[PDB]
Structure 1
Amino acid sequence: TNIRKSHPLMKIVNNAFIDLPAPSNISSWWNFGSLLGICLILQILTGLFLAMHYTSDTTTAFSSVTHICRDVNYGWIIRYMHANGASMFFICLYMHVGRGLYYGSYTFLETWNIGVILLLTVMATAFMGYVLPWGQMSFWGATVITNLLSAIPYIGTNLVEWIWGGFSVDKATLTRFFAFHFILPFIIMAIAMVHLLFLHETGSNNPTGISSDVDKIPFHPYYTIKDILGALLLILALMLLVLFAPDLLGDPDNYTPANPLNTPPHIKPEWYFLFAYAILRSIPNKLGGVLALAFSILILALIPLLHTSKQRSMMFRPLSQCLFWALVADLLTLTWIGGQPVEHPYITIGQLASVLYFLLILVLMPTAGTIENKLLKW
Structure 2
Amino acid sequence: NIRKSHPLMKIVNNAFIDLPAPSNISSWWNFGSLLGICLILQILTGLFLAMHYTSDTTTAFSSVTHICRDVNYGWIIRYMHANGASMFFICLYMHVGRGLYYGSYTFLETWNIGVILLLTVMATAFMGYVLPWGQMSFWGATVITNLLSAIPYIGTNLVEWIWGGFSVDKATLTRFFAFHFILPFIIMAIAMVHLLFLHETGSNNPTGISSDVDKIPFHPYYTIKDILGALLLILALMLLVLFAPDLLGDPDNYTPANPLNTPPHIKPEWYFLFAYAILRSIPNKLGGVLALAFSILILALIPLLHTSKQRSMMFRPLSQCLFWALVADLLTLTWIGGQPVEHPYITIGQLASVLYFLLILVLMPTAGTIENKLLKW
TM-score of the superposed pair, with normalisation by structure 1: 0.99
Aligned-pair distance for 1:366?
1.1
Q: CA deviation at 1:167?
A: 1.3
Q: Distance in 2 between matches of 1:374 and 1:83?
A: 49
Runs of 4+ in 1 over 4 A off after TM superposition: none
Instruction: State the 1:183 CA deviation.
Output: 0.4
Q: Tell me by how many angstroms 1:329 deviates.
A: 0.4
User: How far does the alpha carbon of each residue in 1:340-365 deviate from its partner, in whole angstroms, 9 at most, with x for none?
Assistant: 11111111111111011111000111
Instruction: Tell me, in whole angstroms, the C-alpha distance in 2 between the residues paired with 1:315 and 1:211.
Output: 14
Q: Distance in 1 between matches of 2:17 and 2:341?
A: 54
| Alignment partners' CA distance in 1, 2:3 and 2:268 | 49
The answer on 1:184 being equivalent to 2:159 is no
In the alignment, what sits opposite 1:45?
Answer: 44
Alpha-carbon distance, 1:311 to partner: 0.4
Which deviations, in whole Å up to 9, do the C-alpha atoms of 1:40-74 show, x marking residues without a partner? 00000001000000110111100001100000001
In structure 2, C-alpha distance between the alignment counterparts of 1:74 and 1:7, rounded to whole Å = 41
Which whole-Å deviations, capped at 9, do the CAs of 1:171-193 have from their partners, x for residues lacking one? 11100000000000000000000
Alpha-carbon deviation of 1:332?
0.5
1:102-145: CA deviations, max 9, x gaps? 00000000000010000000000000000000000111011111
| Residue in structure 2 matched with residue 249 of structure 1 by the alignment | 248
Q: Displacement, 1:31?
A: 0.1
Q: What is the CA–CA distance in structure 1 between the aligned matches of 2:157 and 2:22, rounded to whole Å? A: 52
User: CA offsets per residue over residues 219-258 of structure 1, 9 Å max, x none?
Assistant: 0000000100000000011101111111001000000011
Distance apart, 1:12 and its partner CA? 0.5
Q: Could you give the per-residue CA deviations for residues 74-122 of structure 1, whole angstroms, max 9, x where no partner exists?
A: 1100010000000000000000000000000000000000100000000
**Helix, strand or coil at the partner of 1:217:** strand
Provide Cα deviations, 1:287-310, integer angstroms capped at 9, x if missing partner. 000000000000101100010100
Cα drift, residue 267 of structure 1: 0.9
Aligned-pair CA distance for 1:169: 1.3
SS at match of 1:308: coil
SS at match of 1:49: helix
Distance in 2 between residues matched to 1:4 and 1:163, nearest whole Å:
49
Q: CA deviation at 1:201?
A: 0.5
How far apart are residue 266 of structure 1 and its match?
1.4
Task: Give me the whole-angstrom Cα distance separating, in 2, the residues matched to 1:85 and 1:147.
Answer: 28
Alignment of 1:123-272 (within 5 A): 123-272=122-271
Unaligned runs of 5+ in 2: none
Gaps spanning 5+ residues in structure 1: where? none
Separation of aligned partners in 2, 1:182 and 1:361: 35
SS at match of 1:290: helix
SS in 2 for 1:60: helix
Q: Deviations over 1:150-175 (max 9, x none)?
A: 00011111101100001121111100
Q: 2:343 & 2:240 partners in 1: Cα distance?
A: 35
Query: Secondary structure at 1:59's aligned position in 2?
Result: helix
Following superposition, the deviation at residue 8 of structure 1 comes to 1.0
For residues 346 and 137 of structure 1, what CA distance do their matches in structure 2 show? Answer: 22
How far apart are the structure 2 equivalents of 1:59 and 1:339? 30
- C-alpha separation between the residues in 2 aligned to 1:157 and 1:367? 41
Q: State the alpha-carbon separation in 2 of the partners of residues 368 and 8 from structure 1.
A: 49
Q: Alignment partner of 1:148: what SS?
A: helix
Of 339-348 and 128-137, the range deviating more from structure 2: 339-348
Give me the whole-angstrom Cα distance separating, in 2, the residues matched to 1:267 and 1:212: 48
Structure 2 CA distance for aligned equivalents of residues 96 and 221 of structure 1: 23
Structure 1 residue matching 2:7: 3-state secondary structure: coil
User: For 1:317-348, what per-residue CA distance to the aligned partner results, in whole angstroms no more than 9, with x for missing partners?
Assistant: 00000000000000000001111111111111
- 1:195 Cα deviation (Å)? 0.4
CA distance in 1, matches of 2:54, 2:338: 32
What percent of counterpart residues are identical? 100
Q: Give, in whole Å, the separation in 2 of the partners of 1:135 and 1:372.
A: 52
Give me the whole-angstrom Cα distance separating, in 2, the residues matched to 1:51 and 1:235: 22
Q: Distance in 2 between matches of 1:243 and 1:161?
A: 41
TM-score (normalizing by structure 2) = 0.99
